[PDB]
């Protein structure tokens, strides 16, 4: 059981970024196209980039509301027609780089479709960056499987992390970054801040 507590990053952000939290805006999940802040047109055909966009240093420690559709969650869960899932575009451990896929990140946090598991599950850390509520998962999931419920995801952007370890949690083997042979990552980092279930 790989456990990384990782409270240094949040305390560091708290001391060195005393700016008030702000909701940048709603983000709509995409499967093949780089994300954007608009909804008028989301088509692009030319003859898989990371979904999250460049946020920049000035937008550290801010909340970006992300909306995820149920069909994409289905398609990613069993690995059917999903370039990011087949590529394992996941990097981090309870704190993930900007290139990590949001669906794989949420799965890595303990999220699971359907009713909660009936076993002796430990204290879930689905929202590790939210120290106030490390299991801030509000709303009731549909009891019947296959019911399309949309997920509202709040992501807290965090400064760059020195190293992204590789672990096998929830049958996901994330890739390793930040080792001695590799180089310091340039993009920012983010985690699951708040989760609200919407029907």
Partner 1 sequence: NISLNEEVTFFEKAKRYIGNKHLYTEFLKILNLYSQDILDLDDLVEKVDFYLGSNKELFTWFKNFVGEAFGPSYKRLPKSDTFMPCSGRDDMCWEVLNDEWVGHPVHRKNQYEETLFKIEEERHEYDFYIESNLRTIQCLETIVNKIENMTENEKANFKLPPGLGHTSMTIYKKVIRKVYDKERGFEIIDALHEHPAVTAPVVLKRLKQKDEEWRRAQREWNKVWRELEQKVFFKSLDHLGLTFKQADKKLLTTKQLISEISSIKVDQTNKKIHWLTPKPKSQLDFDFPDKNIFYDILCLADTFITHTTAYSNPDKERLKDLLKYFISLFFSISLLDILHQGIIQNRSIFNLFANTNIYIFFRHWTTIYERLLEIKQMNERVTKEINTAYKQVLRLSRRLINGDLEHQWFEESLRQAYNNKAFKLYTIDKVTQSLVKHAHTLMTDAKTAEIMALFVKDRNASTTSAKDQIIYRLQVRSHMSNTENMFRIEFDKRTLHVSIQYI
Partner 2 sequence: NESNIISTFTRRIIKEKSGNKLIYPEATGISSNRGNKLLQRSEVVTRRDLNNSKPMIEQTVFYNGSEHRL
Q: Which is nearer to partner 2, 26 or 182 (CB)?
A: 182
Query: With helix as H, strand as E and coil as C, how does the chain read?
Result: CCCCCCCHHHHHHHHHCCCCCCECCCEECCCCCCCCCCCCCCCCCCCCCCCCCCCCHHHCCCEEEEEECHHHHHHHHCCCCCHHHHHCCCEECCCEECCCCHHHHHHHCCCCCCCCCCCCCCCCCCCCCCCCCCCCEECCCCCCCCCCCEEEEEEEEECCCCCECCCEECCEECECECCCCCCCCCCCEEEEEEEEEEC
State which of residues 81, 114, 131, 184 lies at the interface with partner 1 (CB under 8 A).
81
Cβ proximity to partner 2: between 111 and 177 the closer is 177
The site string for partner 1 over 156-185 (x = CB under 8 A, - otherwise) reads ------------x----x------------
Candidates 6, 17, 24, 28; binder of partner 1 (CB under 8 A) is: 28
CB closer to partner 1, 28 vs 77: 28
Binding residues (CB under 8 A) for partner 2: these are: 49-50, 54, 87, 89, 91, 98-99, 175, 177, 179, 181-187
Q: How far is the CB of 116 from partner 1 (least distance, A)?
A: 26
Residue 47 Cβ vs partner 1, minimum distance, rounded to whole Å: 9
Residue that has been written with the tokens 């700016």 in this structure? 19
* Positions that interact with partner 1 (CB under 8 A): 28, 30-33, 39-40, 42-43, 56-58, 69, 71-72, 75, 81, 168, 173
């Amino acid at each position: 059981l790989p456990n990384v507590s990782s409270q240094s990053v949040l305390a560091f952000t708290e001391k060195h970024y005393p700016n008030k939290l702000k909701n940048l805006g709603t983000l709509y999940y995409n499967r093949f196209k780089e994300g954007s802040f608009d909804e008028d047109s989301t088509s692009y055909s030319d003859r898989p980039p990371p979904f999250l966009p460049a946020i920049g240093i000035q937008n550290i420690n801010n909340i970006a509301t992300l909306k995820i559709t149920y069909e994409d969650i289905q398609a990613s869960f069993n690995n059917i027609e999903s370039p990011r899932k087949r590529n394992n575009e996941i990097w981090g451990c309870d704190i993930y780089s900007d290139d990590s896929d949001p669906i794989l990140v949420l799965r890595h946090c303990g999220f699971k479709i359907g009713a909660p598991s009936g076993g002796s599950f430990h204290k879930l850390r689905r929202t590790p960056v939210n120290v106030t509520n490390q299991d801030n998962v509000t709303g009731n999931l549909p009891l019947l499987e296959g019911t399309p419920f949309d997920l509202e995801v709040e992501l807290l952007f965090l400064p760059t992390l020195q190293k992204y370890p590789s672990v096998k949690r929830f049958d996901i083997t994330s890739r390793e970054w930040g080792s001695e042979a590799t180089v310091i990552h340039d993009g920012l980092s983010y985690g699951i801040y708040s989760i609200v279930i919407k029907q």
